[PDB]
């Protein structure tokens, strides 16, 4: 969030200020393809086992 | 209610994201695209597509 | 209304399955599914989840 | 006719699960290959059934 | 403003009666007719009683 | 309540009954996909067109004068995602750093060493 | 009594009183007594009413005798399912037809059984409730502040007045009047504090001392013997003190009735016999009684402003529910009184029949049918929402519908303490109204109305020396005794009349609906009879046990359950706890109890049936609700009203517009033991679904989920939709009547542009016809101009079934049917029972989906994204317990507070086989390598919520246009456009877009209008052909301008002219700048 | 062969047409459904 | 209830009503070897995790 976000540093908020409209749009689709893709073959998830607390 | 404000080539469905669209993308249900137009003029550069267009 | 042919998850077929069930119940008084050859949840929740309205459907007239 | 409680394409889907036999299915014709006008013997199977 | 607007006119004597496409009429396919198209008759009728008890 | 609640897009015309948006253009008019609609207009002139494309095309609108910072980052399985692969511990093979690569379309056709 | 039993109780419950008691119970009590008294009162006329006849459901047609009609016919018909009225008037008599209740006592169905039923037709499942008028079923709606009550409230900083204290009153039979009484207190807290009261009709105030003399107490001190009752309480008294200087000034009863404007004295006496605290009684000769409540007043006024009882609490449920029955009641009597009046005239004429009963038949539908009570004519001053058109989306969602509550209008939408048990605290409307309209627990029912004397009596007989006769220093600490908010006298040791009365409600002697409350701590004694106060039943505890410590009921009363709830109540072993006696009890939680995994648990006189009772309808379905961010069991209190399953199973007999019925339903792998009594096993409203909570395309991104396209070709949450477009044949007293045919050209042309081809002869379609686009579904004609009726524009299917009938006027009435069967696709909505809504975004099949080496595939796939914020985690759980009951075959229990955990389901699924917490290895479909992640994979029910795509999707460029403005015409169905309202004006004006806003006229409105170069009008009379322009009165043909404007505009302007007002448009600028 | 209209109880084939009343060979119940078409409907099996 | 049913080839990719397969058991390297997974756990992944 914080090196991608909608934010003031923003990787994005530079690409756009030194690059220009145009290159930065097309930045997200590629960082996006790349990733997305990634995540879909080393998947992810969540379940009750994420809540509970150490016995202890 | 009817100055400030009109209702005006205009549709409206359900929206749901595709991660495999150019950020500035929009896909338009073939259906919307086949009632929506778009008037432009012959021109001798365009002639040949809209001829096959309207055809 | 009626058993599901097949099951929606995996495909089995599960039609005929469904009177050999209500059966080995009334009577056998029985695991049933596990019998039936019913073994992954799947086709599983498919029979052990039916609810047979058909039979009330049919209790009307014309 | 159909005087059944389930509708028309009900029955229809269920018929279309129903496994029938495809042992030689391969020396059978997709419709869509066969030159004849919508079906026949050589690329298909008809079924009958009363109740 | 002596031209535009002067503090008499502000006490009608004739009244202005818009037209149709103000107080359009509805008929199904039967009466039908629109809201003013009535406020004016019951106008009108107040009107033609009050002159038939001053002549 | 934006000026970023209606932007101009490029038409893509898809199959079956749907809008089909891109995720980091979410938060601008700040919709989800669970049923929301959404309005489209069609410009009309030639110039129409051209006042939609040259102010309001979405990679105009990035950074967002309200707030001097921009208005569409990476959202949800992309950011999530994006932070396991950076971990040191994320490694990848050949066989895999290809069919990467090859999605990145400006990709200049050269695998880093 | 361990807590698996309070089950059989409560089954005990339903067998006997069902889901909806309220609404029938409430109606039988307006037939059966109500009904009566209201017709036999102001009635006799200058011609007597006796006993009236209320016969069963009629259908009075000429061409036919009376058929005896039944409920299946007139909802096909279109008719009303009301009987007759009969009364012995005296010098037999039909005085109008009313609109009985399905399922009541007049209809039919309250008797046949379960055979019975299916040969009417109606199905069994059906719990009736609501009426059938014109065809469609109507369902009154419960409107919620209790009448004759004392109430004290501060009054801001800011006011003349300091506190006061007021009392609604009206006669609870005869007229009812609604005037109120205030007993004001001037003086704010400083200023040197005077008592003046507001009285009916009296234009100013008057200083409660002459009041009472006037009323009939001349003497000061015997003044504050009303008032105050301990002469040791100097606080009070000083108060009063600068009080009765205000009226030193008038010494007797003949002045005190004067101050109050021979003539004026008169009228006086009036307002204190009909209008002061008209209730009590408007008799006479107890001036005494009422005096003695402006002293109570003026008390409980006083008791507060010196700190000593708060400010009455406004939002306490106890002291607020008018349901059907009594609805009827007021609206009758606004009925037949304006027949008593009638019947007036004909008397007044006859020089020397005439009752017309359709004032009391046509009056009763109008209100009915629409939901506007008060009348008709030039009176829509009345309340729309009373009767509405009950729900058939799902089962639950019609329960729900009659188990509703409204309330007219921050505070009041809060969920109140005394909202426990009685009202369901989930289940309510999101946005707009919310918090104004409640829906009824399980256990909840309404009062319905007791008589008061046969406790009146049994009271001034056991202790009650009646108010008549009383003195304050004899009888100091006198508890005083409350009946219906009358005063009937106070009783000495009362700690015994009131173990005694409640002795004499367990044995069933004063009705098990009345309610008492003692408040020691204020000495006062509560007695309430009334109709529409919310009450739930409780176990009663009594320290009974002269062998330890203890509920009486015993697990001897329970294995024995000609045993009934009734029995369970005539032995006083459960009671019915009213919100007001609620007050003064101590409610036991768990009957028993009053390992580190569950839930840490932290005189009593009730203990609780079960507290998952405090649930109504909705959440009922909801697994673990006590596991959820209260906010989202909220929500799916709504959508479940909005998922798909079967209504009924006579369905396929019913000719309603729009309904759907899931294609295979599924009990649920997880319930509630509540599901029980909600049919919901039987007519489940969704699927249990191999879910899998993971990320993958990334199309299950932002609340859209993946579903697998195979399974849904298997016939997944597939469903079908039927639709009934209706016609009739009208007619006029003169004779001209209209067709049923297939109408080609001739002479008219008025006809559709579909085809009317698959139209038979008789104006109609065969049930086997395809029909589509347009097509036209039936043909009528009017003498040839076309009324035929065309399939909506979106839709389409076959033919279901059709059907000819008669109408009370012979005529013809033709309803048609078409079916659908509907398919899941990429957008349509779905939804667990967690808030958890979602749309599709792709459809993937078994190869593409992800798996498990099991071979199990996922039919869903949401977005573990949806769980973090939502906190839904109940959802997490009904997966993991359903995985177990997937594989075990036994029913897994989700029910509300119960002994199950997630530690012990986890190890159920371990001895199974598979991880202790779900989660499963999973190879991801495309490449076959193993996840590098594992999954949450597991059977979760979910709901498949209407609202598909296809019913939404709308384009529009250039259609029909509207008359008045000339711009676009409004909605999808007739081909609308939509709106480019304000706010998205704005935008474009933010964005500089000029032109492209400009482009207002060419996407709508535009038009072409000539102004005038002088007087700046569109006057201008273009005769666009020959030129010749003009415009007399200005007399020009010369100086004119053709202007580009929106008509919404010219509009805007030939309106304000009309009105006198004369915008005048100039083509050039003269005032320069 | 041939059928018009039958009766929402006794279903029992009637057939009409104008003013010849619309009820039934016995049954006063005044309802009745139109039959089924003799035109052969085509079903696909997804 | 009288029908005729029209059988024809078809596969899986047309419609389910096809496939001959019907769920199909898939699995390799049973001990984490190649580690192409990363085990959830709380305390122990071997012991948590059936064998
Ligand atoms: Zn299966
Ligand atoms: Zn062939
Ligand atoms: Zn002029
Ligand atoms: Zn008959």
Same mark, same amino acid.
């Given at each position: 969030?914080?090196?991608?976000?909608?934010?003031?540093?923003?990787?994005?908020?530079?690409?756009?200020?030194?690059?220009?409209?145009?290159?930065?749009?097309?930045?997200?689709?590629?960082?996006?393809?790349?990733?997305?893709?990634?995540?879909?073959?080393?998947?992810?998830?969540?379940?009750?086992?994420?809540?509970?607390?150490?016995?202890? | 209610?009817?100055?400030?404000?009109?209702?005006?080539?205009?549709?409206?469905?359900?929206?749901?994201?595709?991660?495999?669209?150019?950020?500035?993308?929009?896909?338009?249900?073939?259906?919307?695209?086949?009632?929506?137009?778009?008037?432009?003029?012959?021109?001798?550069?365009?002639?040949?597509?809209?001829?096959?267009?309207?055809? | 209304?009626?058993?599901?042919? #097949?099951?929606?998850?995996?495909?089995?077929?599960?039609?005929?399955?469904?009177?050999?069930?209500?059966?080995?119940?009334?009577?056998?008084?029985?695991?049933?599914?596990?019998?039936?050859?019913?073994?992954?949840?799947?086709? #599983? #929740?498919?029979?052990?989840?039916?609810?047979?309205?058909?039979?009330?459907?049919? #209790?009307?007239?014309? | 006719?159909?005087?059944?409680?389930?509708?028309?394409?009900?029955?229809?889907?269920?018929?279309?699960?129903?496994?029938?036999?495809?042992?030689?299915?391969?020396?059978?014709?997709?419709?869509?290959?066969?030159?004849?006008?919508?079906?026949?013997?050589?690329?298909?199977?008809?079924?009958?059934?009363?109740? | 403003?002596?031209?535009?607007?002067? &503090?008499?006119?502000?006490?009608?004597?004739?009244?202005?009666?818009? &037209? &149709?496409?103000?107080? &359009?009429?509805?008929?199904?396919?039967?009466?039908?007719?629109?809201?003013?198209?009535?406020?004016?008759?019951?106008?009108?009728?107040?009107?033609?009683?009050?002159?038939?008890?001053?002549? | 309540?934006?000026?970023?609640?209606?932007?101009?897009?490029?038409?893509?015309?898809?199959?079956?009954?749907?809008?089909?948006?891109?995720?980091?253009?979410?938060?601008?008019?700040?919709?989800?996909?669970?049923?929301?609609?959404?309005?489209?207009?069609?410009?009309?002139?030639?110039?129409?067109?051209?006042?939609?494309?040259?102010?309001?095309?979405?990679?105009?609108?990035? *950074?967002?004068?309200?707030?001097?910072?921009?208005?569409?980052?990476?959202?949800?399985?992309?950011?999530?995602?994006?932070?396991?692969?950076?971990?040191?511990?994320?490694?990848?093979?050949?066989?895999? *750093?290809?069919?990467?690569?090859?999605?990145?379309?400006?990709?200049?056709?050269?695998?880093?060493? | 009594?361990?807590?698996?039993?309070?089950?059989?109780?409560? %089954?005990?419950?339903?067998?006997?009183?069902?889901?909806?008691?309220?609404?029938?119970?409430?109606?039988?009590?307006?037939?059966?007594?109500?009904?009566?008294?209201?017709?036999?009162?102001?009635?006799?006329?200058?011609?007597?009413?006796?006993?009236?006849?209320?016969?069963?459901?009629?259908?009075?047609?000429?061409?036919?005798?009376?058929?005896?009609?039944?409920?299946?016919?007139?909802?096909?018909?279109? $008719?009303?399912?009301?009987?007759?009225?009969?009364?012995?008037?005296?010098?037999?008599?039909?005085?109008?037809?009313?609109?009985?209740?399905?399922?009541?006592?007049?209809?039919?169905?309250?008797?046949?059984?379960?055979?019975?039923?299916?040969?009417?037709?109606?199905?069994?499942?059906?719990?009736?409730?609501?009426?059938?008028?014109?065809?469609?079923?109507?369902?009154?709606?419960?409107?919620?502040?209790?009448?004759?009550?004392?109430?004290?409230?501060?009054?801001?900083?800011?006011?003349?007045?300091?506190?006061?204290?007021?009392?609604?009153?009206?006669?609870?039979?005869?007229?009812?009047?609604?005037?109120?009484?205030?007993?004001?207190?001037?003086?704010?807290?400083?200023?040197?504090?005077?008592?003046?009261?507001?009285?009916?009709?009296?234009?100013?105030?008057?200083?409660?001392?002459?009041?009472?003399?006037?009323?009939?107490?001349?003497?000061?001190?015997?003044?504050?013997?009303?008032?105050?009752?301990?002469?040791?309480?100097?606080?009070?008294?000083?108060?009063?003190?600068?009080?009765?200087?205000?009226?030193?000034?008038?010494?007797?009863?003949?002045?005190?009735?004067?101050?109050?404007?021979?003539?004026?004295?008169?009228?006086?006496?009036?307002?204190?016999?009909?209008?002061?605290?008209?209730?009590?009684?408007?008799?006479?000769?107890?001036?005494?009684?009422?005096?003695?409540?402006?002293?109570?007043?003026?008390?409980?006024?006083?008791?507060?402003?010196?700190?000593?009882?708060?400010?009455?609490?406004?939002?306490?449920?106890?002291?607020?529910?008018?349901?059907?029955?009594?609805?009827?009641?007021?609206?009758?009597?606004?009925?037949?009184?304006?027949?008593?009046?009638?019947?007036?005239?004909?008397?007044?004429? @006859?020089?020397?029949?005439?009752?017309?009963?359709?004032?009391?038949?046509?009056?009763?539908?109008?209100?009915?049918?629409?939901?506007?009570?008060?009348?008709?004519?030039?009176?829509?001053?009345?309340?729309?929402?009373?009767?509405?058109?009950?729900?058939?989306?799902?089962?639950?969602?019609?329960?729900?519908?009659?188990?509703?509550?409204?309330?007219?209008?921050?505070?009041?939408?809060?969920?109140?303490?005394?909202?426990?048990?009685?009202?369901?605290?989930?289940?309510?409307?999101?946005?707009?109204?919310?918090?104004?309209?409640?829906?009824?627990?399980? $256990?909840?029912?309404?009062?319905?109305?007791?008589?008061?004397?046969?406790?009146?009596?049994?009271?001034?007989?056991?202790?009650?020396?009646?108010?008549?006769?009383?003195?304050?220093?004899?009888?100091?600490?006198?508890?005083?005794?409350?009946?219906?908010?009358?005063?009937?006298?106070?009783?000495?040791?009362?700690?015994?009349?009131?173990?005694?009365?409640?002795?004499?409600?367990?044995?069933?002697?004063?009705?098990?609906?009345?309610?008492?409350?003692?408040?020691?701590?204020?000495?006062?004694?509560?007695?309430?009879?009334?109709?529409?106060?919310?009450?739930?039943?409780?176990?009663?505890?009594?320290?009974?046990?002269?062998?330890?410590?203890?509920?009486?009921?015993?697990?001897?009363?329970?294995?024995?359950?000609?045993?009934?709830?009734?029995?369970?109540?005539?032995?006083?072993?459960?009671?019915?706890?009213?919100?007001?006696?609620?007050?003064?009890?101590?409610?036991?939680?768990?009957?028993?109890?009053?390992?580190?995994?569950?839930?840490?648990?932290?005189?009593?006189?009730?203990?609780?049936?079960?507290?998952?009772?405090?649930?109504?309808?909705?959440?009922?379905?909801?697994?673990?609700?006590?596991?959820?961010?209260?906010?989202?069991?909220?929500?799916?209190?709504?959508?479940?009203?909005?998922?798909?399953?079967?209504?009924?199973?006579?369905?396929?007999?019913?000719?309603?517009?729009?309904?759907?019925?899931?294609?295979?339903?599924?009990?649920?792998?997880?319930?509630?033991?509540?599901?029980?009594?909600?049919?919901?096993?039987?007519?489940?409203?969704?699927?249990?679904?191999?879910?899998?909570?993971?990320?993958?395309?990334?199309? +299950?991104?932002?609340? %859209?989920?993946?579903?697998?396209?195979?399974?849904?070709?298997?016939?997944?949450?597939?469903?079908?939709?039927?639709?009934?477009?209706?016609?009739?044949?009208?007619?006029?007293?003169?004779?001209?009547?209209?067709?049923?045919?297939?109408?080609?050209?001739?002479?008219?042309?008025?006809?559709?542009?579909?085809?009317?081809?698959?139209?038979?002869?008789?104006?109609?379609?065969?049930?086997?016809?395809?029909?589509?686009?347009?097509?036209?579904?039936?043909?009528?004609?009017?003498?040839?101009?076309?009324?035929?009726?065309?399939?909506?524009?979106?839709?389409?299917?076959?033919?279901?079934?059709?059907?000819?009938?008669?109408?009370?006027?012979?005529?013809?009435?033709?309803?048609?049917?078409?079916?659908?069967?509907?398919?899941?696709?990429?957008?349509?909505?779905?939804?667990?029972?967690?808030?958890?809504?979602?749309?599709?975004?792709?459809?993937?099949?078994?190869?593409?989906?992800?798996?498990?080496?099991?071979?199990?595939?996922?039919?869903?796939?949401?977005?573990?994204?949806?769980?973090?914020?939502?906190?839904?985690?109940?959802?997490?759980?009904?997966?993991?317990?359903?995985?177990?009951?997937?594989?075990?075959?036994?029913?897994?229990?989700?029910?509300?507070?119960?002994?199950?955990?997630?530690?012990?389901?986890?190890?159920?699924?371990?001895?199974?086989?598979?991880?202790?917490?779900?989660?499963?290895?999973?190879?991801?479909?495309?490449?076959?390598?193993?996840?590098?992640?594992?999954?949450?994979?597991?059977?979760?029910?979910?709901?498949?919520?209407?609202?598909?795509?296809?019913?939404?999707?709308?384009?529009?460029?250039?259609?029909?246009?509207?008359?008045?403005?000339?711009?676009?015409?409004?909605?999808?169905?007739?081909?609308?456009?939509?709106?480019?309202?304000?706010?998205?004006?704005?935008?474009?004006?933010?964005?500089?877009?000029?032109?492209?806003?400009?482009?207002?006229?060419?996407?709508?409105?535009?038009?072409?209008?000539?102004?005038?170069?002088?007087?700046?009008?569109?006057?201008?009379?273009?005769?666009?052909?020959?030129?010749?322009?003009? @415009?007399?009165?200005?007399?020009?043909?010369? +100086?004119?301008?053709? $202007?580009?404007?929106?008509?919404?505009?010219?509009?805007?302007?030939?309106?304000?002219?009309?009105?006198?007002?004369?915008?005048?448009?100039?083509?050039?600028?003269?005032?320069?700048? | 062969?041939?059928?018009?209209?039958? =009766?929402?109880? =006794?279903?029992?084939?009637?057939?009409?047409?104008?003013?010849?009343?619309?009820? =039934?060979?016995? =049954?006063?119940?005044?309802?009745?459904?139109?039959?089924?078409?003799?035109?052969?409907?085509?079903?696909?099996?997804? | 209830?009288?029908?005729?049913?029209?059988?024809?080839?078809?596969?899986?990719?047309?419609?389910?009503?096809?496939?001959?397969?019907?769920?199909?058991?898939?699995?390799?390297?049973?001990?984490?070897?190649?580690?192409?997974?990363?085990?959830?756990?709380?305390?122990?992944?071997?012991?948590?995790?059936?064998?």
């Amino acid at each position: 969030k914080k090196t991608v976000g909608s934010g003031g540093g923003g990787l994005i908020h530079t690409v756009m200020r030194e690059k220009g409209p145009k290159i930065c749009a097309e930045l997200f689709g590629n960082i996006q393809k790349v990733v997305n893709y990634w995540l879909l073959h080393n998947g992810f998830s969540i379940g009750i086992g994420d809540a509970i607390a150490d016995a202890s | 209610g009817n100055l400030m404000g009109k209702r005006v080539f205009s549709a409206r469905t359900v929206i749901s994201g595709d991660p495999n669209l150019e950020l500035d993308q929009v896909g338009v249900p073939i259906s919307i695209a086949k009632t929506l137009s778009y008037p432009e003029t012959v021109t001798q550069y365009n002639i040949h597509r809209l001829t096959e267009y309207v055809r | 209304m009626i058993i599901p042919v #097949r099951c929606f998850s995996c495909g089995k077929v599960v039609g005929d399955k469904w009177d050999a069930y209500l059966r080995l119940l009334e009577e056998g008084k029985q695991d049933a599914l596990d019998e039936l050859k019913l073994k992954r949840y799947c086709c #599983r #929740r498919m029979v052990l989840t039916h609810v047979d309205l058909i039979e009330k459907f049919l #209790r009307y007239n014309p | 006719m159909n005087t059944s409680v389930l509708a028309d394409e009900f029955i229809s889907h269920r018929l279309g699960l129903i496994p029938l036999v495809s042992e030689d299915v391969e020396e059978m014709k997709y419709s869509r290959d066969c030159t004849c006008e919508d079906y026949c013997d050589e690329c298909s199977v008809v079924l009958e059934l009363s109740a | 403003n002596e031209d535009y607007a002067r &503090p008499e006119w502000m006490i009608i004597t004739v009244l202005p009666v818009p &037209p &149709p496409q103000v107080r &359009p009429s509805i008929a199904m396919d039967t009466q039908g007719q629109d809201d003013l198209t009535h406020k004016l008759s019951d106008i009108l009728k107040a009107n033609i009683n009050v002159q038939k008890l001053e002549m | 309540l934006h000026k970023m609640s209606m932007m101009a897009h490029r038409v893509k015309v898809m199959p079956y009954s749907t809008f089909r948006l891109n995720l980091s253009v979410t938060s601008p008019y700040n919709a989800d996909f669970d049923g929301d609609e959404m309005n489209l207009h069609v410009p009309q002139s030639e110039e129409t067109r051209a006042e939609l494309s040259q102010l309001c095309a979405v990679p105009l609108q990035i *950074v967002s004068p309200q707030s001097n910072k921009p208005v569409m980052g990476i959202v949800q399985d992309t950011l999530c995602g994006v932070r396991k692969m950076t971990l040191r511990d994320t490694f990848i093979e050949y066989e895999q *750093v290809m069919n990467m690569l090859f999605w990145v379309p400006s990709w200049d056709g050269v695998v880093p060493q | 009594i361990t807590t698996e039993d309070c089950w059989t109780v409560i %089954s005990a419950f339903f067998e006997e009183k069902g889901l909806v008691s309220q609404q029938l119970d409430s109606f039988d009590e307006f037939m059966e007594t109500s009904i009566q008294d209201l017709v036999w009162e102001e009635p006799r006329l200058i011609i007597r009413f006796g006993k009236i006849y209320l016969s069963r459901p009629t259908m009075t047609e000429a061409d036919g005798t009376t058929h005896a009609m039944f409920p299946q016919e007139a909802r096909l018909r279109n $008719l009303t399912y009301s009987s007759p009225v009969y009364l012995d008037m005296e010098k037999k008599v039909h005085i109008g037809k009313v609109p009985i209740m399905l399922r009541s006592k007049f209809c039919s169905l309250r008797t046949l059984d379960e055979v019975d039923l299916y040969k009417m037709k109606e199905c069994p499942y059906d719990m009736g409730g609501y009426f059938v008028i014109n065809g469609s079923e109507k369902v009154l709606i419960a409107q919620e502040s209790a009448a004759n009550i004392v109430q004290v409230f501060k009054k801001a900083a800011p006011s003349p007045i300091s506190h006061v204290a007021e009392i609604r009153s009206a006669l609870e039979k005869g007229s009812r009047l609604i005037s109120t009484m205030q007993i004001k207190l001037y003086g704010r807290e400083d200023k040197g504090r005077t008592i003046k009261a507001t009285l009916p009709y009296v234009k100013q105030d008057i200083p409660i001392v002459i009041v009472f003399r006037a009323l009939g107490v001349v003497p000061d001190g015997e003044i504050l013997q009303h008032i105050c009752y301990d002469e040791n309480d100097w606080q009070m008294l000083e108060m009063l003190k600068p009080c009765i200087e205000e009226g030193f000034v008038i010494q007797d009863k003949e002045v005190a009735l004067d101050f109050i404007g021979e003539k004026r004295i008169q009228y006086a006496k009036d307002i204190l016999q009909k209008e002061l605290l008209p209730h009590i009684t408007q008799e006479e000769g107890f001036e005494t009684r009422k005096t003695f409540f402006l002293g109570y007043m003026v008390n409980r006024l006083l008791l507060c402003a010196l700190e000593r009882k708060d400010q009455d609490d406004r939002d306490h449920f106890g002291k607020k529910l008018d349901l059907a029955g009594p609805l009827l009641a007021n609206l009758f009597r606004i009925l037949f009184r304006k027949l008593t009046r009638e019947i007036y005239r004909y008397m007044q004429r @006859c020089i020397e029949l005439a009752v017309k009963s359709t004032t009391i038949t046509s009056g009763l539908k109008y209100s009915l049918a629409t939901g506007n009570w008060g009348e008709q004519k030039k009176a829509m001053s009345s309340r729309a929402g009373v009767s509405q058109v009950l729900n058939r989306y799902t089962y639950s969602s019609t329960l729900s519908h009659l188990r509703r509550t409204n309330t007219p209008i921050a505070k009041p939408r809060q969920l109140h303490n005394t909202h426990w048990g009685l009202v369901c605290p989930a289940e309510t409307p999101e946005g707009q109204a919310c918090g104004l309209v409640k829906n009824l627990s399980l $256990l909840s029912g309404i009062s319905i109305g007791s008589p008061s004397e046969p406790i009146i009596n049994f009271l001034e007989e056991w202790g009650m020396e009646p108010l008549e006769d009383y003195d304050p220093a004899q009888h100091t600490k006198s508890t005083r005794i409350f009946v219906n908010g009358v005063w009937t006298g106070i009783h000495r040791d009362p700690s015994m009349l009131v173990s005694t009365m409640r002795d004499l409600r367990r044995s069933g002697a004063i009705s098990p609906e009345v309610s008492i409350i003692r408040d020691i701590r204020e000495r006062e004694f509560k007695i309430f009879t009334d109709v529409g106060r919310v009450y739930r039943p409780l176990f009663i505890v009594e320290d009974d046990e002269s062998k330890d410590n203890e509920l009486r009921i015993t697990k001897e009363h329970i294995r024995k359950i000609v045993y009934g709830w009734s029995s369970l109540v005539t032995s006083g072993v459960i009671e019915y706890v009213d919100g007001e006696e609620e007050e003064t009890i101590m409610i036991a939680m768990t009957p028993e109890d009053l390992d580190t995994a569950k839930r840490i648990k932290p005189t009593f006189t009730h203990c609780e049936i079960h507290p998952s009772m405090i649930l109504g309808v909705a959440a009922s379905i909801i697994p673990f609700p006590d596991h959820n961010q209260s906010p989202r069991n909220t929500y799916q209190s709504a959508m479940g009203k909005q998922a798909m399953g079967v209504f009924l199973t006579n369905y396929n007999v019913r000719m309603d517009t729009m309904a759907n019925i899931l294609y295979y339903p599924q009990k649920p792998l997880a319930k509630t033991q509540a599901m029980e009594y909600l049919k919901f096993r039987e007519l489940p409203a969704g699927q249990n679904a191999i879910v899998a909570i993971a990320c993958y395309s990334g199309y +299950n991104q932002e609340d %859209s989920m993946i579903m697998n396209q195979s399974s849904i070709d298997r016939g997944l949450f597939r469903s079908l939709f039927f639709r009934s477009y209706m016609d009739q044949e009208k007619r006029f007293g003169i004779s001209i009547v209209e067709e049923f045919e297939k109408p080609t050209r001739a002479t008219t042309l008025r006809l559709k542009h579909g085809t009317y081809e698959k139209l038979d002869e008789d104006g109609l379609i065969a049930p086997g016809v395809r029909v589509s686009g347009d097509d036209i579904i039936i043909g009528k004609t009017t003498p040839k101009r076309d009324a035929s009726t065309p399939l909506r524009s979106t839709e389409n299917g076959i033919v279901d079934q059709v059907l000819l009938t008669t109408n009370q006027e012979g005529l013809k009435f033709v309803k048609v049917r078409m079916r659908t069967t509907k398919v899941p696709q990429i957008g349509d909505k779905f939804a667990s029972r967690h808030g958890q809504k979602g749309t599709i975004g792709v459809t993937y099949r078994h190869e593409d989906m992800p798996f498990s080496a099991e071979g199990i595939v996922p039919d869903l796939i949401i977005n573990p994204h949806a769980i973090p914020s939502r906190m839904t985690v109940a959802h997490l759980i009904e997966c993991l317990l359903s995985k177990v009951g997937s594989i075990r075959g036994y029913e897994g229990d989700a029910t509300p507070f119960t002994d199950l955990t997630v530690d012990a389901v986890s190890n159920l699924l371990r001895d199974n086989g598979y991880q202790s917490r779900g989660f499963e290895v999973m190879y991801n479909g495309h490449t076959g390598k193993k996840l590098m992640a594992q999954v949450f994979f597991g059977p979760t029910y979910y709901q498949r919520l209407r609202h598909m795509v296809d019913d939404k999707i709308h384009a529009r460029a250039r259609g029909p246009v509207q008359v008045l403005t000339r711009q676009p015409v409004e909605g999808r169905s007739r081909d609308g456009g939509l709106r480019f309202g304000e706010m998205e004006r704005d935008c474009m004006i933010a964005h500089g877009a000029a032109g492209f806003l400009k482009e207002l006229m060419e996407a709508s409105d535009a038009f072409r209008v000539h102004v005038c170069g002088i007087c700046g009008l569109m006057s201008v009379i273009a005769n666009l052909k020959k030129n010749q322009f003009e @415009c007399r009165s200005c007399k020009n043909k010369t +100086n004119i301008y053709q $202007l580009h404007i929106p008509y919404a505009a010219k509009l805007l302007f030939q309106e304000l002219m009309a009105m006198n007002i004369a915008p005048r448009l100039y083509t050039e600028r003269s005032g320069v700048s | 062969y041939g059928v018009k209209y039958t =009766c929402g109880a =006794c279903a029992h084939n009637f057939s009409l047409n104008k003013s010849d009343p619309v009820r =039934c060979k016995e =049954c006063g119940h005044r309802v009745i459904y139109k039959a089924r078409t003799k035109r052969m409907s085509k079903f696909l099996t997804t | 209830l009288n029908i005729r049913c029209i059988a024809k080839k078809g596969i899986a990719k047309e419609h389910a009503k096809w496939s001959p397969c019907s769920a199909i058991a898939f699995e390799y390297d049973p001990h984490n070897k190649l580690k192409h997974t990363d085990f959830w756990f709380e305390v122990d992944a071997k012991k948590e995790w059936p064998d």
